Amino acid sequence: MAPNIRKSHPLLKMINNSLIDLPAPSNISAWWNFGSLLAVCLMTQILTGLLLAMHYTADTSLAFSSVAHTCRNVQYGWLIRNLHANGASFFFICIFLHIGRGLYYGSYLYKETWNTGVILLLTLMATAFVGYVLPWGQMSFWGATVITNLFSAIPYIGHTLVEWAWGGFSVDNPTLTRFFALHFLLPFAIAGITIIHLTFLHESGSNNPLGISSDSDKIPFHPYYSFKDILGLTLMLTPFLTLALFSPNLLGDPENFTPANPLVTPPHIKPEWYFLFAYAILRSIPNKLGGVLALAASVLILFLIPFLHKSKQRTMTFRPLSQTLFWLLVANLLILTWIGSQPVEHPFIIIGQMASLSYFTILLILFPTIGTLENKMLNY
């Protein structure tokens, strides 16, 4: 047997070996706080989602009103609804920084942890996609219509997969009910895979800002990082709540306060902020199929980063050239975001094609190149 029941117990040993005695680098910065936030966020989305699902009705004649009934009649239903929709945003803000950090500090060298990370991203994106359709407003319907319609651009198997996915000839009730089911389901898969994510991670342990072995200076996750993570939570949570409670409709499209109508196409069909950059890249390539492929790759490109690392150093902490290139990339993304919210007209169309072009260029050409160049400047 073992003296303390935290080491021997098949369950308390688990809570312990991953949240209490777990060896963590003594110097990980606040950019290492997002993993826990992502987790907490996930548990939060699930809780508020269940609460909402208990008053929802997956039917085209009742969806829009069931949500209105929830906000108007359910005790604190409005608050739960606010937290859920805005929670999805927080979720993405957190996930984008999580990724950024990983790109900057070369965490992707932990390939399995990284590849499962990508799968989590995709699952989260599909989840928000189906979830967005549920209130059944105008943007819910046209977003669903426009996007799922891209698959018919695939060869042969296309025109089919679409009418199979819709369960009919157009986005209609059968599509709605199957979307509720998927939205209710995917989050659990996310939780599932998140477990796998943390398992692979624990093999190696966390990376750290200098990118050098932290074996000479490890510290117990608790109280160091439990306190640091809890603080990081409250710090983020304040703006989340502030924006949520004081400017509820800041992020939302007003076109969604109008019940879906198949006979009235909205003037400007655009996604929530977190999908804008991808929308921009989608529209950058005029040709239904090539635009689809460009969108696909805009995210699937993440599976390649691990292979385009040429530097002899792990992070960018000591690589000034890569740093600016990195911030160029970040700024490249605000631009695509902005473009994604603008109509398809000059000068936006060309600015858009450029930003897309630069996006893939920076990741596939410049980064690997500058890394090589940098090794020679260190005489390596």
């Binding site: 680098p25 110097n27 750290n208 000479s216 200076d217 792990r314 000591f318 000034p320 260190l378 005489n379």
Partner: protein, 101 residues
């Protein structure tokens, strides 16, 4: 002329690891060759490197750096590991080539 030398010393300073007291070699990502190279280091060089690293990690956690005086100078950076690393790679390639044909 001295172009390459000016560039090199420029980058070296731009990089900034010397501000933590790290030697260029202390910053190498530990892939397999480097892992092996380190195992071949003499006890003293190994322990000196170990302290330098633990020292940088402590500065990093503190969000501080070394006093300008203590920064490693470009021409005083001892490339202690490069000789070993180059050999480890020399051997590996030999084995690799030999196992093909």
């Amino acid at each position: 002329g001295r172009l390459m030398d000016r560039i090199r010393k420029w980058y070296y300073n731009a990089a900034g690891f010397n501000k933590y007291g790290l030697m260029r070699d202390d910053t190498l990502y530990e892939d397999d060759d480097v892992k092996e190279a380190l195992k071949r280091l003499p006890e003293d060089l190994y322990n000196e490197r170990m302290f330098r690293i633990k020292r940088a990690l402590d500065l990093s956690l503190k969000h501080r750096i070394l006093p300008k005086e203590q920064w490693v100078k470009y021409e005083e950076d001892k490339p202690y590991l490069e000789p070993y690393l180059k050999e480890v790679i020399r051997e590996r390639l030999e084995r690799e080539a030999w196992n093909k044909k």
